[PDB]
Amino acid sequence: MRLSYEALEWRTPIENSTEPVSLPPPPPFFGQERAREALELAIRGGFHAYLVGPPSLGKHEALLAYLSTQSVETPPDLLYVPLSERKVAVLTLPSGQEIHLAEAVEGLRFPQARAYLEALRRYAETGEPQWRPNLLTSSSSGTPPPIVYEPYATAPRLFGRLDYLVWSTNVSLIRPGAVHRAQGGYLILDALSLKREGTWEAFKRALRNGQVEPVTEPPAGLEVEPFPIQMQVILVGTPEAFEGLEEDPAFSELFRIRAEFSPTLPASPENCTALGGWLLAQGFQLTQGGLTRLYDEARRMAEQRDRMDARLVEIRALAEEAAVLGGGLLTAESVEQAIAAREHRSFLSEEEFLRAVQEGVIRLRTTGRAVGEVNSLVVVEAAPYWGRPARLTARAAPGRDHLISIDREAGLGGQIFHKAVLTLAGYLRSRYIEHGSLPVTISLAFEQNYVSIEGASAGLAELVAALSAIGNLPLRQDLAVTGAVDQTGKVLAVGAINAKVEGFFRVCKALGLSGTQGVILPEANLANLTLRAEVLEAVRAGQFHIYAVETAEQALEILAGARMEGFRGLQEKIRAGLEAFARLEEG
């Protein structure tokens, strides 16, 4: 099927583009129900939890805002008291009450402070010439609760430190760490940091056994008694950041509640609107046009007509660049130009590539017809992931049912690539049986490919080239091709469909548009097409053409300008080619 401009258009229409936006801030965790409800449960039940989602989601910001709205009982006073001259314990009094104990001591009624006072009793009994409570923390409300985010999870920062006054030390030289500051509230840490600092095991011992040891230096140490830990820990990390941790059975035991963010949200008015409010809260001066463009780029970042990328910090970062281009103002234009400027800043490799193509240093065709040749479409695996066309040739000779992927034999093709070739072979053997095993050897080469290549998305291109070589069928070089194929010859979905399409358009444009150039792609990828303005208008101008297909044969018909049947059709020519190949092989 041909995809009209109408079918291809996916952009949000803009009305009153320069009108300022005025909208209330959405609540934290908007469009992230799962994560919020998981977090809600964790709060309600006092469970430890971990927030998991890709980078740049705004997980930290969402977390701190959510915990900002919370209410707890005012935290107890927290102190170290000595139980000896070489021992100290961690103790809670009700709040503000340590200063009465401290001052009573400052002389020389508090039920909780018993053991400290018992051992507080023989200077007079031996003239024997360090003893006053060390306050760690105290606060005047549990609203908001204690919220301590320690991004750098070293032992001292988690557990506090011993200072040494020359060396001697005592209770008053013990400083607290994040763990102490988070009592009665929330401690937030990064999973990656716990690993990189090697403090995971000591962190388990604090949670599981209440061991919280101030960091020493390797003269003499105070023993420090364990105490019952009162805090809720929330870990933050990417899915990969948590896999080091999930292998330790201790992790799932300790952190029962997963709070997982979706990498995308439904592309809805309610999320567009929520995005506007969030941008306004961030301090941007936003126009309707600017909001609409950012909302659409978010859909395009997701490669989904019906979803939008949830990475609020990526969207904010693009908005920041747009703002500078609009002189402080976030307009449609400012956003289009900021998107275009990022592309330009990373365009050197494509400009080099296009120059090479224009010079013939890379040999590519975008017009005419040729047998056993097709433009397939690849993606360069370096950000920002430019698509490019790659010329693929198929050559058929009489031989013993062999399909040779030259790139995979040479060691450039990966496993999934190899699998795609074997799948085609399964198709061809089982499809053409009248001569027993296939009477041809077919060799496939990505012609000027000097690098490793991986994936199944060349399946369709390879199969149609093979069929062309088999039947001597001239194929259009003005349509590039992408798609995977299964063993039954159906065409399956591929990745990076926008980059692939846009990359062929870019070479066609650089060589001068013919007016008949285009791309053939999987019907299954229709939901992924979020093509850039310039390709859309070229399709609207009749200057470029997209075909969606469901089978390999459908693709071959478009390429060889004919139907499989109505014999004189392509199928009899393919059969005729095989008959010829079989005769040369046997007689």
């Binding site: 479409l377 690849v378 695996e381 690539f417 490919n449 690098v451 290549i453 991986e454 998305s457």
Partner: peptide, 5 residues
């Protein structure tokens, strides 16, 4: 860089 299809 390595390439994906």
């Amino acid at each position: 860089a390595p390439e994906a299809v």
